[PDB]
Design a protein around this ligand. Sequence first.
Ligand SMILES: NC(=O)c1ccc[n+]([C@@H]2O[C@H](COP(=O)([O-])OP(=O)(O)OC[C@H]3O[C@@H](n4cnc5c(N)ncnc54)[C@H](OP(=O)(O)O)[C@@H]3O)[C@@H](O)[C@H]2O)c1
Ligand SMILES: NC(=O)c1ccc[n+]([C@@H]2O[C@H](COP(=O)([O-])OP(=O)(O)OC[C@H]3O[C@@H](n4cnc5c(N)ncnc54)[C@H](OP(=O)(O)O)[C@@H]3O)[C@@H](O)[C@H]2O)c1
Lengths: 653, 653
Amino acid sequence: WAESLIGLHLGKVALITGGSAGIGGQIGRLLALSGARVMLAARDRHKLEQMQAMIQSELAEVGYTDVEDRVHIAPGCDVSSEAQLADLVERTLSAFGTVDYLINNAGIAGVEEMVIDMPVEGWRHTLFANLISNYSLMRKLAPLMKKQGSGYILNVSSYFGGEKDAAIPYPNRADYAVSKAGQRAMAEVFARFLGPEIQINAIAPGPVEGDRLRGTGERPGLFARRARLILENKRLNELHAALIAAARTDERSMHELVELLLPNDVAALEQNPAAPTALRELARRFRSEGDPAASSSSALLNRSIAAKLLARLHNGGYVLPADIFANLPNPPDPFFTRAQIDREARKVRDGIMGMLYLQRMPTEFDVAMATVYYLADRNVSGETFHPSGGLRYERTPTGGELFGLPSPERLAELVGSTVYLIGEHLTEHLNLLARAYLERYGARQVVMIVETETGAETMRRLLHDHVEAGRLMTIVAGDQIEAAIDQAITRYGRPGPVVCTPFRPLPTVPLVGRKDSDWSTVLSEAEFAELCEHQLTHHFRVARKIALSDGASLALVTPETTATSTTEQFALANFIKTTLHAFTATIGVESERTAQRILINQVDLTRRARAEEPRDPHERQQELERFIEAVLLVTAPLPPYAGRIHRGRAITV
Amino acid sequence: WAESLIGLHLGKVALITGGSAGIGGQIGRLLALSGARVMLAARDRHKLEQMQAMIQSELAEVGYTDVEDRVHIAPGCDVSSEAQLADLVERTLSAFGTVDYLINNAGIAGVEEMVIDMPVEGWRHTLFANLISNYSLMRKLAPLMKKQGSGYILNVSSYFGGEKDAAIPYPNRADYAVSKAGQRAMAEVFARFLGPEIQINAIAPGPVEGDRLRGTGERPGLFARRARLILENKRLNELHAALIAAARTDERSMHELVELLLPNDVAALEQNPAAPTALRELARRFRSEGDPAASSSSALLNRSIAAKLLARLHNGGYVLPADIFANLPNPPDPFFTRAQIDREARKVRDGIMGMLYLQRMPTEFDVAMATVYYLADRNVSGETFHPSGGLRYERTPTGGELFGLPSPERLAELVGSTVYLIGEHLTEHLNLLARAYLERYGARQVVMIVETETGAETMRRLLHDHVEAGRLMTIVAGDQIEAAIDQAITRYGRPGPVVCTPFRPLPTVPLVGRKDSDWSTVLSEAEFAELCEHQLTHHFRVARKIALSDGASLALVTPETTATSTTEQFALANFIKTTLHAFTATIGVESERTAQRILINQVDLTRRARAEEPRDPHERQQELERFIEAVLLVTAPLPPYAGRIHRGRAITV
Ligand SMILES: NC(=O)c1ccc[n+]([C@@H]2O[C@H](COP(=O)([O-])OP(=O)(O)OC[C@H]3O[C@@H](n4cnc5c(N)ncnc54)[C@H](OP(=O)(O)O)[C@@H]3O)[C@@H](O)[C@H]2O)c1
Ligand SMILES: NC(=O)c1ccc[n+]([C@@H]2O[C@H](COP(=O)([O-])OP(=O)(O)OC[C@H]3O[C@@H](n4cnc5c(N)ncnc54)[C@H](OP(=O)(O)O)[C@@H]3O)[C@@H](O)[C@H]2O)c1
């Protein structure tokens, strides 16, 4: 079977991250069988040694000589660590010389929580492991590839990273979806700069049969974990919604309502006459729909669900002691039975198998085979190859350019509203937007949340009249946007419209170096992380906080490009736009599954080509008015199908 | 080099259309080298015999025995002929038994004219050759593939067929672009029905080095023909624009103005004091920018350009004798010099090489190699594989769902306008639209163009009040829509808004048969041609006529899908929507290159999933109002960047 591989990649040097098991292990195996010298990078030394011995033994069997020179390993390499990425390149370069193929395969599952329960550091770690590492390794390897005249960068993305002009929601996986979308976006925008010497593509497999999805006897896989999370998330969401519902119609504090959960007894809560109807109906549901052998049928929660519930409540402005669940009676194992988890795990697998046009998943060998043949194609760059797939899953087309003004019914709902505007760099857009809300649509007040004092002063001066009339309030957020939103809520009340623009502009730096250059001026590994911080994480932090604020409409705004903007700014802007679509679509679906009525849409200020951009002051004026219309179209509340249309969507100004 | 191919497709039977040269010839060659038995279909017997002898000789060299049983030919097979497609299947089935791989490779360049100069029969021929043939062959071969448990349908589409959620304009190639887009759309929508047994994908190469693009010594290729057409089209467009411009400010008839072109002397026209300034300035331009060795620098036109100019004028309502150019002095060869054509051909190739991220084109061998490896992948269906490419060309994202009402300035322009509504089946949409234009936006009159008398009576009854007040006029078009538009122009005046809805609904028929069934009920080859006639050609015919009507705004409306609609209707509706986007985007760009100020946009009534569709009477009412807003957003005229935004675009209702 390996006879079709001999000579296919002979003379090539390949670097495979996550090369000790899964898809990566197979790509490394098949590349070695194809004649390539391979370096396998992963954390565990033992797994890396096992795979190396397995590949070397196989190479010897087909006829190869000095097989130890063909398969090298790089243990203790965590792709989320920059230092480890620098040590990997040096170890690979010393071992084999220049790298021809960079296989950015490593990809952690990530946080596996809804955005509202996703720690900011967890989101950051996934971006570093899955996305920032891809740029870091390309940045260290592309100068030597351009010098020798050839090279290939392959990013192992996913079907759940979406496609060129459509976003795919991936609930409970926003960090993951974004990182996969960014890997694809990198191939799409860097191809024009990396060519003619270097090819850059993404592979986006659909679900694959293997240990990641199926799991081992010792450790549960993606399906079993997703099954356990479905059950745990269901308990968290139901408890949270019932507490928010009861709080509306009950005069007791959230603290007093949470105190009713403390005996942690489903039966005692159901028959408690002093408890609100929403909590009693919830207890009845927990015992009625539950498994009698599961302690989740007799106990309300466990220490883990209690901590997530507490953080949701704290993040949503409710005042509760941090020790409220300290003496919570711990339910006896199992909280959810193996029967409940298996039924849920079977539903996940059956649902996926149903979505697949071919009603079958490829093996890791199959995906690696399609990839190794794909790597032989020298005439394709900036593409996303789908080695498996074709799924019935819903996609959200992005890039609607043709739109108009929202209805007068929706506009009259803006009268007397509280507007939050977040930004710094886009002073013109922020000034015009604050004025449109206050002067045209009679909003009660605008809270201008900036990053710095210099930004606050610039906005206060531009809006001097509204500042004088107590209509425009300014808050300096710094790198504490969550505390800044809390300040705005406490002092000026909860918002209706929320317009989140980036604080920072896109950098004006080269994306590739000249053939004989040192690449010293080229966008660094640290600057690429900052780009993701300022242009992705910024929006995620605001969305995480605003998704717990009832009655809010959030517009996530992407960077601005002009006829003046550098070609590098166009690339980076298009990279962001695409990557943030994955986030916007994912959180849009997650928001449906919450108690809070919250709309989240994306407004794109960036365009693919310079030819589309305005060229005169009249064409600029049309653009700025189009921006206001786009924001109003997504921020004006829907007065009591239309909800599906007005969420996780993105329009191009 | 062929050692990597041995056994890759061993035991497989492949049918390759256009298998005697180009990409198809190489796919057949490489599939045979891979162990497949191949049938090559094309028109010329000699070319087919040459290729067969070449492949058989090669097979013998690598070791194969009885090579004559491995390579068969099917001469005199024109894919545009249904009879020839039936004879091909029977000849292939008798020769080898069941076909595993259907390679729908044949693809004619087509008419190679702007839509306004494209004969309706030429457009039809391209659809038959390039698109209808793909369904026809699949329809005859899929029953036997489903029976044996396996099969593969591969449509050789193009980069110029666009992508899942973005259309790519291909000026002067609308028939071609549409056929390529339809080949991709077929793979996208039929995969769910054809699985698990049958895979259906498209390949979409970017430009490929070969005889199609480069040409032979005897016959010019795509580039040289495109160079010649650029020059000929430039002469046609400039002459046409100057005649339309002069007609505006001159009281002479179009007949009298065309009479000034009859001496066919550039110098005599320039210095003719009696000639209009636009024609004199045109003559000066023809000699000033021309090559002195070309007769196009001293003569205005030739018999070929004169006939195209005459048909444009006739199709635009100008009255001229059919014999007006009968005695036109024929210019001496060359009309355009080899120098002019070569310069133009070099500009085409350099422009394409510039657009390519890799700045190189693959060979036909390279594309066939990537395809033959791709065919080995058993786990992918409903996809478009790009074996080459990555181009800087502009794309038009489709699927904008979020939009609103147009500006009050644009709406007041509708006051006193003449509206043309084209349709039959969608009585509710036509009644509500006619009423919105007349009652809400004060249009002077609505001309309701239907297909049949039964349709006219249904509309006249629904709009009884407007019919009584002389506000609603009805015309029965039958299969003579061009003559029906002429009638409306002569009798009621030229239109402002033009809303083109399909006359016919989508069929309610199976798209695949049961494993053991005869497939007798499945959408026939003739019904698929009718689907293209009613749902594609219908719009093309209207657009071709309306693109010559100054001040018109054309909205091309795609079929309606509901929560009631069959799953087969959803597939076919999504097939149309995608295929028509290629047309809409192409004609939008061509319209910029014309004298007439004409806007052309697409309004989609169809949606991908049933889940998106309304479920109650209130959700239906929102949908119908969204339809009116969408049509107004694209039909309200732009009062004197914004033109680029308002053209070749498509929104989803
Ligand atoms: N499986 C699917 O269904 C599927 C579908 C679409 C896309 N993908 C993508 O395909 C790629 C490979 O996935 P897979 O299914 O093969 O996953 P996997 O089984 O989790 O990958 C295991 C490999 O990754 C390494 N690894 C894990 N965490 C790492 C880290 N922090 N740093 C470095 N190496 C690390 C492992 O070794 P150590 O743990 O010792 O480091 C091992 O070598 C990923 O990018 C994933 O997103 C997978
Ligand atoms: N070349 C490119 O740059 C490019 C790029 C993207 C996509 N494609 C697509 O790739 C496919 C093959 O293109 P190519 O470049 O190989 O074209 P090509 O060189 O024109 O194809 C020649 C082959 O097609 C046959 N053929 C032509 N007209 C036919 C007809 N009416 N019926 C049956 N066979 C016919 C020819 O034989 P006879 O004339 O004797 O019949 C010969 O076998 C097409 O579908 C095309 O759209 C090509």
